[PDB]
Amino acid sequence: MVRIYTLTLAPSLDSATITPQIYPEGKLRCTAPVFEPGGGGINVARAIAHLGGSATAIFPAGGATGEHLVSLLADENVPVATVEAKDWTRQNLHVHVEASGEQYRFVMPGAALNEDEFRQLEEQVLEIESGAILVISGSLPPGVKLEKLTQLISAAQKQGIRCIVDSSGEALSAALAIGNIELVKPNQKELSALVNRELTQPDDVRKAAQEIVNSGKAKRVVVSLGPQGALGVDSENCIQVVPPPVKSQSTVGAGDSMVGAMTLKLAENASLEEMVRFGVAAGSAATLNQGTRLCSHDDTQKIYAYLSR
Amino acid sequence: MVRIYTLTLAPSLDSATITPQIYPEGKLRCTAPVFEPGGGGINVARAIAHLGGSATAIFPAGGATGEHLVSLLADENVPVATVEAKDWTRQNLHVHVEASGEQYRFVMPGAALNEDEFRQLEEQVLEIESGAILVISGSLPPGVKLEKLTQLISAAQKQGIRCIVDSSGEALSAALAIGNIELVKPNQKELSALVNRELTQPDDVRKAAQEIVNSGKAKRVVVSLGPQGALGVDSENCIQVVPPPVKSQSTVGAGDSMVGAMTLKLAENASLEEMVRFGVAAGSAATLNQGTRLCSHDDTQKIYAYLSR
Amino acid sequence: MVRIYTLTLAPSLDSATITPQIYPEGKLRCTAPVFEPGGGGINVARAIAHLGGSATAIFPAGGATGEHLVSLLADENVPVATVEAKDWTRQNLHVHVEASGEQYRFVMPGAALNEDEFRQLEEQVLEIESGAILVISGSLPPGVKLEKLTQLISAAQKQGIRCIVDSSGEALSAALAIGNIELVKPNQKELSALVNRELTQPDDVRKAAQEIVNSGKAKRVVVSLGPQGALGVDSENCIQVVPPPVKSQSTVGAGDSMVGAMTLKLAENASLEEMVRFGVAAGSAATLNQGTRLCSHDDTQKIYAYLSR
Amino acid sequence: MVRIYTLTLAPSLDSATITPQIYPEGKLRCTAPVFEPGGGGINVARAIAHLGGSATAIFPAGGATGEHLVSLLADENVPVATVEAKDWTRQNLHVHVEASGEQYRFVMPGAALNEDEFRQLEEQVLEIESGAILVISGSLPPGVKLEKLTQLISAAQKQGIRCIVDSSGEALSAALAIGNIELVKPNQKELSALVNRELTQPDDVRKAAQEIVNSGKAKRVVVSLGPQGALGVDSENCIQVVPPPVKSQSTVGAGDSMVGAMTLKLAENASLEEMVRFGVAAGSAATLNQGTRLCSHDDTQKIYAYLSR
Ligand SMILES: Nc1ncnc2c1ncn2[C@@H]1O[C@H](COP(=O)(O)OP(=O)(O)OP(=O)(O)O)[C@@H](O)[C@H]1O
Ligand SMILES: Nc1ncnc2c1ncn2[C@@H]1O[C@H](COP(=O)(O)OP(=O)(O)OP(=O)(O)O)[C@@H](O)[C@H]1O
Ligand SMILES: Nc1ncnc2c1ncn2[C@@H]1O[C@H](COP(=O)(O)OP(=O)(O)OP(=O)(O)O)[C@@H](O)[C@H]1O
Ligand SMILES: Nc1ncnc2c1ncn2[C@@H]1O[C@H](COP(=O)(O)OP(=O)(O)OP(=O)(O)O)[C@@H](O)[C@H]1O
Ligand SMILES: Nc1ncnc2c1ncn2[C@@H]1O[C@H](COP(=O)(O)OP(=O)(O)OP(=O)(O)O)[C@@H](O)[C@H]1O
Ligand SMILES: Nc1ncnc2c1ncn2[C@@H]1O[C@H](COP(=O)(O)OP(=O)(O)OP(=O)(O)O)[C@@H](O)[C@H]1O
Ligand SMILES: Nc1ncnc2c1ncn2[C@@H]1O[C@H](COP(=O)(O)OP(=O)(O)OP(=O)(O)O)[C@@H](O)[C@H]1O
Ligand SMILES: Nc1ncnc2c1ncn2[C@@H]1O[C@H](COP(=O)(O)OP(=O)(O)OP(=O)(O)O)[C@@H](O)[C@H]1O
Ligand SMILES: [K+]
Ligand SMILES: [K+]
Ligand SMILES: [K+]
Ligand SMILES: [K+]
Ligand SMILES: [Mg+2]
Ligand SMILES: [Mg+2]
Ligand SMILES: [Mg+2]
Ligand SMILES: [Mg+2]
Ligand SMILES: [Mg+2]
Ligand SMILES: [Mg+2]
Ligand SMILES: [Mg+2]
Ligand SMILES: [Mg+2]
Question: 90-119 in B: which are within 8 Å (CB) of D?
């Protein structure tokens, strides 16, 4: 298997806290937070670790929050390659409400990057050897022009780095601007925005995915469909995989778990069907766990065996 | 095609109202309500009308609220057969919040039924011809012992009335106590309560469904799975049908729409596959319409065509 | 003491129910409701009963819901004078959420009145002897022109009936159109709407209340101020009364409790200070009790003793 | 006028963000946060600046978040005296929901303080001149034994530093353990916890306040009562001051604004009446401004003039 790297331009040090009730105006007393790594590529690398593989997470880190982020990943045995940034690593908030069992997730932008910090990040990316896989996942932080992301991807592909993309909005469109992306995983909202049209008819998702493949923007499009599983599209195949009928406890982290799983199958040169099935297995495995916990090896294996008959 | 009847032991006259915001403590000023028919069997009959068929709704009605319920169904051209009850027809409340677009649904028990009234309802059911279909759908109202529900179904079956059951809790178990039910449609929670175990493993739903068929309790079990569609089980077949990837606007009425569709297919003596496909098409068609609106013929046809492609 | 009557043109049979959690989209299973009398004048009469006096509630009642409303008042020993109405007595909903202890209150319009039913109600009102007190409290139901309310009040005053008004919006303005109202109790929002201006400066409430008295619209204006108590205004006096610093459990019914209390003091020809103090005592006593329960005699007496030094 | 200092053992760098709707499970996309100074003593110092006075804020600051906190105060021209702490300055989150206009406030503990750092803070406090005022306001951060808070206050008082305390829980009791506190401002809940009993009777708050004065624990006790204003108690006087009837826009910052105002009055050696009046004026002035904004000079002056009329 070739080596796997992930890139998170907007990582975070997330706080998970608990409060008895939720209501406006008054002070909600919240417990001492538990800190956890945040960010698309970072969680993809964590999911891969859970599944028994290894992925090196590349990301900017700033201030004491950044140091703690790196410290957390060290304890989880997730290898990293960081760039020191001036602006401190930002924090998102996850609140569990004890009385209802509900969770609330407040997602703010990542820290700013200056041009020099982005250049260092690109330098880290270009140290990746030909044939290896790079997963670019997450939002685009302030300070980065859209074309800089496209230029990074182009440079990467130029020296044989195989790119996988999970993003949204203008970043996702920009990441796909040059094309030849190995794999992209939009969810339904992300797909609709990317093809710039509403997907209201039964066959619209399939057709939109095929449109992306046919255009040369991506070799593989896996449209993830929440509880309905996913639809994977190749130049030769269209397959839908639906998860088993088991209740979701918490959907947080399903997307990153699926991407990490599919990345591993891509590294193994698996078939489209095997890739999508393993992706659904890990994404749905993620839903079995409370709060922000990602997929576990054993749950993913169990669901994958079910999906494989 | 044989004739179709439905039975709703706990009907309601539902109020749909609108308010700008939702918050506790203060008076929420709600608009003058729009009244609509409520109740499982009643909604099955309405869905059947939408799909081009005809079903007679049997139910107790009491007071001016009951009169209005009857009048609403007359205006919708749904045939009825009623028993006048002493306790007035109860009301559930549907609240649309303008600021969020969210809907809140407060579901209270149906009016009480005395023993005389239940025997009157039983008399109506036993006037149904042999070979016709009776759909018993909805909650069990106060005043009716579970044994009486068992007795009604046993009485109906002895003379060739084909029974379809959609209920929950002790009522569902009681309805299946006699066995030889033509079709039962539990959702996942209802199936779990019926077999009395958590269904936490991938194959648990299928195994539970097969257990009910094998035990002779039901000829067909269709476990409905929300956005995952449904799993249909026979003595000979097992199929899962997943809806197309279209966004749900409002899930209200999905269950009764699905039951209405499957009932029509059952009356046409369709295959298990055709029955479940049409059921999923109608159930998911219902979700395309806002609020409490059930499935439309055209949306159901479109989804069914896709599933049958 | 002279006799006391209340008029409720829009009464209701309210349902109080309990549900474990509150959230949109899904069915919220609510307990078998406890029915209670609803409507301004009706609750004023109930509050008066709690305080040891007697008030006859005049109101339209229709259908089985109306009969149960009358039945509830009989059990509480509240004398009534009803007019049978064609349109059935409507229901508001009070929902207690067990997990949070919050209550939600959905308030819909009252049943319609036709011209004949209103004429009968006016006839009941004009049977009231000179010197007696009539409390007109609550919203204006559909079917009643604004000037009909004004004409009723004018006719009442013409034969010596002393009128007290608690209402809002166009109804309140109309009720005050002719003037010489003995007592009106707007809250702050109601006062602002009545004088048609925002009350943003420290002395604005006082000035607005005095404007109403000086105009001849009302002899006494008691602006109720929620937790801040009330400001009472006469042609000769301006007094603010603030409740004791005890936590409110539930504010439902505070307004009607205050009005019933003030009505009793008006019947005793009490001073403005005594009237307002007893009103604050009963209104704040109401807040000590969970849900919709009105003021208790003992709590009101205790707070009144405190307010009187 | 003597000099004024404040002490905030648990400061914060607060993030204020905006999101369109609030609901659980999904990612709530929040705007790039606006940062603001947080913490009891810090806010007291800011309120004092608004009211035209000057107060030096003493607090631990750590990391880039602490640097930003210090920078924000510099921009607001609030003098500070800081101790560099190992643990980085923590962040609370204020969320405005656009659809409802509601604000949600998630309050987490302050950064940890080690024993060395606390002694450094103690050293700063003991550099305050005799006769000057020190306001100790806010929660107690992890790492500080209650006895150390008692020791700090005892140390300060021995050399003529006049101490004002605003806190809660065990910290408030510990702060009052030494006695001879110049002024304490519990709210109702804080007073109840302090005297360890429910305050359910009309005179309970006053009696509890007098108990603290009589015991020698505090020279002055001002129990703040939210919209009911405040009750101020001396060895010689007892007064209640109620704000004018103006609608609160947002209650955030009322407490610290009130403390800032009373501190300034205390420095001017004002009467108990003048102190409580100005306190209520500033507290209520704070409520006129949206979000976390404290009292403005002009609004405070306007309310104070009314209270003094
Ligand atoms: N259980 C609740 N449900 C809904 N709203 C609440 C609830 N508790 C408090 N609130 C709201 O919060 C406001 C203040 O509540 P609270 O008694 O906690 O004071 P606080 O200012 O938040 O905290 P503190 O005691 O530290 O001063 C109330 O006015 C109310 O609007
Ligand atoms: N409610 C659910 N029940 C079962 N499986 C789910 C559920 N939601 C997500 N999954 C699984 O996780 C996979 C990915 O989730 P989804 O399609 O929601 O992507 P995403 O929106 O990009 O995730 P995320 O919000 O974490 O970024 C799905 O394809 C599916 O396998
Ligand atoms: N927009 C809102 N968001 C959250 N809570 C609210 C909102 N509006 C009102 N409330 C709550 O409802 C209580 C009263 O609100 P409101 O001003 O509507 O008075 P009311 O008693 O409900 O009605 P009325 O004016 O008829 O007397 C407030 O104390 C507050 O707790
Ligand atoms: N979120 C959804 N998206 C797409 N289709 C749906 C969704 N929810 C329900 N359906 C369709 O409706 C059918 C029945 O709905 P479901 O499985 O939820 O039954 P139910 O819980 O008995 O419904 P109900 O609550 O109305 O009684 C499903 O099998 C599916 O076809
Ligand atoms: N604890 C909860 N918090 C927030 N939302 C919930 C919660 N429980 C259910 N919901 C919402 O209600 C929808 C359906 O929930 P549920 O499992 O109760 O099915 P139902 O259609 O309401 O009832 P039924 O079992 O009778 O078919 C869910 O899709 C979810 O959106
Ligand atoms: N939160 C509270 N705390 C203490 N007393 C209260 C509170 N709210 C109301 N009261 C008492 O009840 C009296 C009337 O309540 P309020 O001023 O809110 O009138 P209202 O809005 O017309 O009441 P309602 O909504 O029931 O019709 C007040 O003057 C006061 O004495
Ligand atoms: N307007 C809403 N009201 C109530 N709940 C909502 C609303 N929008 C989303 N949700 C809840 O959040 C879940 C996911 O919402 P959403 O479409 O935003 O996906 P997401 O996972 O939060 O974000 P993303 O598109 O980045 O993957 C839904 O399943 C639903 O439960
Ligand atoms: N809803 C309100 N309306 C008018 N004035 C208010 C209101 N709430 C607070 N105030 C003013 O602010 C002063 C202090 O507020 P409060 O009694 O709530 O203290 P607190 O609970 O310590 O404040 P905080 O939660 O900010 O720390 C009050 O005495 C009063 O003057
Ligand atoms: K999870
Ligand atoms: K619908
Ligand atoms: K009450
Ligand atoms: K404010
Ligand atoms: Mg995603
Ligand atoms: Mg998602
Ligand atoms: Mg159902
Ligand atoms: Mg359901
Ligand atoms: Mg009122
Ligand atoms: Mg009110
Ligand atoms: Mg405070
Ligand atoms: Mg407070």
Answer: 99-100, 102
